[PDB]
């Protein structure tokens, strides 16, 4: 695949800033916890850096195209993405298989500023049937994974909702 995962130490400034963004963007959800569980905070177990030369160069090439179409402004953000396909994403990169055809804003790939919003999709649409072991959308035992991603928004269409 070409991907390697570098485990970060909890003492690393880069671990601590990523943990902080994870924890500070939790919110309550209108479903009372139905899809993603009931919680105000996480226990962070590991943070790994994803390194893949081809995928990085594919990203920066598109970033430059977007930037030149938008007064030299990629409008780059760091956002969360939860999906049952995280393991494929990190090795193969994002593509149309990771888009939600039936999503509110069209057949695209969805990202969130609230880490707790992405947590609702770790086990699939609406939390699916919850964790594989216990079939529990609010499982406090089983380990979950999210991605913290670098995303190019360019000129973004504003949708009020």
């Amino acid at each position: 695949s070409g991907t390697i995962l570098i485990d970060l130490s909890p003492d690393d400034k880069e671990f601590q800033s990523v943990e902080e963004e994870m924890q500070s963007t939790v919110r309550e959800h209108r479903d009372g916890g139905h899809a993603g569980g009931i919680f105000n905070r996480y226990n962070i177990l590991k943070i790994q850096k994803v390194c893949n030369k081809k995928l990085w160069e594919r990203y920066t090439h598109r970033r430059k195209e977007v930037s030149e179409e938008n007064h030299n402004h990629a409008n780059e953000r760091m956002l969360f993405h939860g999906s049952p396909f995280v393991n494929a994403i990190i090795h193969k990169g994002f593509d149309e298989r990771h888009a939600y055809i039936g999503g509110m804003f069209g057949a695209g790939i969805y990202f969130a500023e609230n880490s707790s919003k992405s947590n609702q999709y770790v086990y699939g649409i609406g939390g699916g049937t919850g964790c594989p072991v216990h079939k529990d959308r609010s499982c406090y035992i089983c380990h979950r994974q999210l991605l913290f991603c670098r995303v190019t928004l360019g000129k973004s269409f504003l949708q009020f909702s």
């Binding site: 995962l5 009931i38 990203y59 994002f94 695209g108 609010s138 995303v151 269409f157």
Partner: protein, 47 residues
């Protein structure tokens, strides 16, 4: 996979109702995101 609105590169979903909710975003080219950090975690039961 669909197209961006003409002349745009993404969509911002603005939480017009929920006071505390932050924005959500959609892209239509997978080359517009790179997965930088893989975070392993548990949610925690409130006390």
């Amino acid at each position: 996979m669909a197209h961006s609105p003409p002349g745009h590169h993404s969509v911002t979903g603005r939480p017009s109702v929920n006071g505390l909710a932050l924005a959500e975003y959609v892209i239509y080219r997978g080359e517009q995101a790179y997965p930088e950090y893989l975070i392993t975690y548990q949610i925690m039961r409130p006390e």
